[PDB]
């Protein structure tokens, strides 16, 4: 990450070893559940995009999801690059330059460089947005890694509603799709999958009841 | 959380890795139980929204229980806002602008936009407006959450009378209660609900009697 | 705890997570033993009541233990009202109040309202005042729990002096009593409770011998 | 590593314990694997040659690859002073010298000595130099320390898609090779070596296809 | 510990949690023997007395030991009174008093007292002369509690030189004495007390034989 | 180790608890491996003699070692001080004295004394002198205390070269000797000491053969 020195030269801070460790341990017990991607977020903050590679770098195992991960950086970039395209030939000595996709992915880009574009007036914050790429790529791996869909999950025979409804939102979190989307799946599957008993009861409830009176409705049925 | 530079712009301090593996910890060994809740509020002291959720989104599992605690978010955005009305339109260049219930829990605020709130002369402190929504949520949690009923707390005729205190006190602290509530179930069930050789020389200590007294009292036998 | 700003506006310190992890753990794995107290007064130096509260909040189970020390905390509370009466109405604009009973032990007063006292010339050192209520408190737990009284404690046919030392003194640490009363124990206990072949021994060596010439003394026998 | 002294001499900085502890365990745990190389090179930044050989200096066992590791430094070193050759004889009092490639790697220089090459207008980055060398040499040990070869990947009868691609691209990272080579064995022998029923898959998608989409299209055969 | 404040009043350091946390686990992993005391000493330094009794306080068990060493600051207390004897009366509005020993030893003296008198011009300094009588107690407990004597300690048949020696000097570090008694043990007893074998050998070398030539002279037998 | 005031008066810092506990779980794991040399050094940078001590101290166990090194310590004071003679007699008030051989190791000298020597213009480094002492003593136990010799590692019938190479490798490091010394043993031995089917391989690839050449050429046979 960065801060400033006693005369203010922008200056880089070395990431921790235990928020290396952290996230390299979070990786090895939780896989890609969805949890680990605020978790890779909060490790992260603050991150240049050396960084960030680092921190992906220190990954073993789990190669597939890591491909697929470059190939969403690589679609960013190419996007990042036709909205913002460079002037070419030769630089202005000292002055910084426009930094491309693969800049800001910290392919082509020194650390140096980097720090330069952060700590600008105005800053340029590459950190944050290949941050964004890289969440982006790392949802995509948390939905195609998912074992079961929203659509599959119904309540059980003699499933505790608490358990089911834990199912159910475990699994929309690791879904595909905007708020508009989730509701409507929440409001579509969440009673019609419910087992008869309950559903009967909540249909009773009628759309305006909250979880909270949903489940207590359900308690002791 | 946030801190003071050497030029004193207010800036964002990145929450600890031994902070958040704290949380998720906590979680993982201890569920719901009351103590979870100081804990929770002990581990974000000086937090944003940002840092809230970003603590929120570290526990995996436990997904009714965080959606309700959505629902409970809602509620004190939509009553903050009947509150406080947004007067809309344009926006004066530069100058920030009033908070809405949204903005509060972060869903429609960015974190530049939070430390600006929060370190205002005067300050509008969101992350502690928010914090507080939380913890009500926690608490309705909690109490769902809680097996048994402060009524069905009863002294067992071989339980040590320090056993049978230590599972009403454990149980009343999950209760739905103001003091005056939790006094008059105190007042009402703990001796009502001793056994009977306990009971009876409780009557007779009457009801100025300590806790330490009455544990004394019923020691022996 | 309480720390200078830049600008030396007196600023709350967020209690460290391995503090809090500290005493938890603790209390899970000792129990209330009298070493608990050096500890929780050790974890709390600096503590203001909010961060105090904080502590006692994160136990789990002991619910009768911190009931009584609730009901010591009053008894403190209500003294200190008695000696230090409020003069009450309105309240000079801007200027800060006087603690109340329940001030001090953080019912009744903000976090920002005990930084204010603390940090006062001269200050009101009300962390202080209320962690001698709790310590006190904690204390008479310790009594309370303590299983054995010192006046059963004898040395074994077959124990050696060392032992039964460790237990005399063990269990001594525990009691309720002033210095006078621990020495009185001391000096009519000690030894007339060691074992005959030992006492013998110890009578010989009339009432100046220090410890570590009784241990000495009674080493090959 | 360096930092700033209140005067502005410019002073070392000790190596944590932990920064230590965590690059030995790493070496323990996981050997050479490629994951390994990226950790050391994050409990390295900032390192002068001294750090970077006390670091390698822990490392017990393993011994054949650490003296292949100096061959590469040696190799380097040499080459380093071909393309630098020193000015010989006297030495201007007080002034610095002109390292050589045995002063880079910490063999014939002080530490001192190597403070003051790396924080010097213009500075001297010996540390960063060194760090190359020995990265080299990391990348020849765990290709040499590794298994199996790219074209012994083959895909099984029963094996699901996703851990063909995640040993296919776990051995591939362990390859010698440039990027250029890496596309080849890749776009040559991912879908040759796949098996039977998904191969016809892919042949069928064609060769503009993501991973995504590779690994999609092949989920329910 | 003590620390100098932004406006350079002397202000207080609160004890680590890991320095705590360290010292308890030592003593529960190691008893008293003889390296104890260099970790007393090495996590105590910078102590007042307070510290230092928060440190005695938390060992729980080994309550004989503690009462010895109570015994052994008490004779110390005494001494220095004895040495320096207090001017009694009146005290100067503001000034400070000499420390009596019982000040010294914190039982009659506040932590503000402590800092005060080992923070002048020119320092009283309490915590290390307590700290010196701490560990003048902590070496007579260890010597009670050493299970043999330097006399008993011959080396076995079979007994591997480099054994003998270990338990030689683990046995020798654990006795009552100055630097001439112990050089007079070694020179005494060392080879005096050898097996047959290496016993020979040893006289024959005469008495100038460093110890890395006795053994290896011994290695071979 | 050392650090600068706030008015910049030269002052001692206390050794971390983490960097103690460091030393001795290492000793316990790693008893006196070469790599143990490299973590003493590197934990004990910037150390004073009493640092030094205070580490050496913290060793329980291994005593015949610990007194072999005194003994190298004596012999390295014996000659600094023939080295550099004391003129003796009265000391200039205030100003400060060589330090001795025996001022050097701590046995002779306060702490206050030895910052004094460390922080001079120009700077008496004793804390550096006395780690060289420690260190060829640390070489010389690591020596004695390895299980065989450089002359008996052969290679296996059925040893991967790798292996032999490590084991070659290993027993070097632990030997008394020069580089030059050590280049005869590799030069000579490494091969001519390699089994019968792979030191034909070896003759054939001629003396300028690296190691990677060696191993590779080794591989399949
Ligand atoms: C911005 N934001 C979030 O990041 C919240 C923070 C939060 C997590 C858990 C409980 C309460 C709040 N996080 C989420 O919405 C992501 C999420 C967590 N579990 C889910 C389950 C299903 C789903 O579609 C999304 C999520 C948020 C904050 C407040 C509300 Cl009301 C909604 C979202
Ligand atoms: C403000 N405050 C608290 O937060 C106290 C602090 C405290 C906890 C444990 C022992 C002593 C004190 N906490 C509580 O009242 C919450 C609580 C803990 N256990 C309970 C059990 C039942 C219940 O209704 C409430 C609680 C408080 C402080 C002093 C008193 Cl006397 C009462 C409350
Ligand atoms: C102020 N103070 C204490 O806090 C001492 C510090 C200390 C603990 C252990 C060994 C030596 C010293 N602590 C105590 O007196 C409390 C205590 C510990 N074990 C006990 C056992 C019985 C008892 O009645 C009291 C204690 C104290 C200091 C010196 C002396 Cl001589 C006496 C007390
Ligand atoms: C500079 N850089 C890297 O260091 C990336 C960072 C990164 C790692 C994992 C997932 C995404 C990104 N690292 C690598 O390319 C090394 C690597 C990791 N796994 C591999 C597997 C095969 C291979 O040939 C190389 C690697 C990089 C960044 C972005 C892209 Cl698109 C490519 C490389
Ligand atoms: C001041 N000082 C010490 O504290 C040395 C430091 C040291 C420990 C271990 C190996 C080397 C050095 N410590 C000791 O003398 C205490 C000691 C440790 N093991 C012992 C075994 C027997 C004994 O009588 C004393 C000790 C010391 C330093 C150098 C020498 Cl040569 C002698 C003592
Ligand atoms: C100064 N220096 C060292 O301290 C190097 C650093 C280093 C360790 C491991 C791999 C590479 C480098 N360390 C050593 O030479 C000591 C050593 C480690 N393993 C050994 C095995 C045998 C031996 O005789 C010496 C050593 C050094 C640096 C570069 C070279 Cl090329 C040689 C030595």
């Given at each position: 990450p960065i801060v400033q020195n006693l005369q203010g030269q922008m200056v880089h801070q070395a990431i921790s070893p235990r928020t290396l460790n952290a996230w390299v341990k979070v990786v090895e017990e939780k896989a890609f559940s969805p949890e680990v991607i605020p978790m890779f977020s909060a490790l992260s903050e603050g991150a240049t995009p050396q960084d960030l590679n680092t921190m992906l770098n220190?990954?073993?195992?789990?190669?597939a999801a890591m491909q697929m991960l470059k190939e969403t950086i690589n679609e960013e970039?190419?996007?990042?690059?036709?909205?913002?395209?460079?002037?070419?030939?030769?630089?202005?000595?000292?002055?910084?330059?426009?930094?491309?996709?693969?800049?800001?992915?910290?392919?082509?880009?020194?650390?140096?460089?980097?720090?330069?574009?952060?700590?600008?007036?105005?800053?340029?914050?590459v950190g944050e947005i290949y941050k964004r790429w890289i969440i982006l790529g790392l949802n995509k791996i948390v939905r195609m890694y998912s074992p079961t869909s929203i659509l599959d999950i119904r309540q059980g025979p003699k499933e505790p509603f608490?358990?089911?409804?834990?199912?159910?939102?475990?699994?929309?979190?690791?879904?595909?799709?905007?708020?508009?989307?989730?509701?409507?799946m929440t409001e579509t599957l969440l009673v019609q999958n419910a087992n008869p008993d309950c559903k009967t009861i909540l249909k009773a409830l009628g759309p305006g009841a909250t979880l909270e009176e949903m489940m207590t409705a359900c308690q002791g049925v």
């Open positions: 220190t990954v073993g195992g789990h190669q970039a190419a996007e990042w690059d036709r909205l913002h395209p460079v002037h070419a030939g030769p630089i202005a000595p000292g002055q910084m330059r426009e930094p491309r996709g693969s800049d800001i992915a910290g392919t082509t880009s020194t650390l140096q460089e980097q720090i330069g574009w952060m700590t600008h007036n105005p800053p340029i914050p608490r358990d089911y409804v834990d199912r159910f939102y475990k699994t929309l979190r690791a879904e595909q799709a905007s708020q508009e989307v989730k509701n409507w």
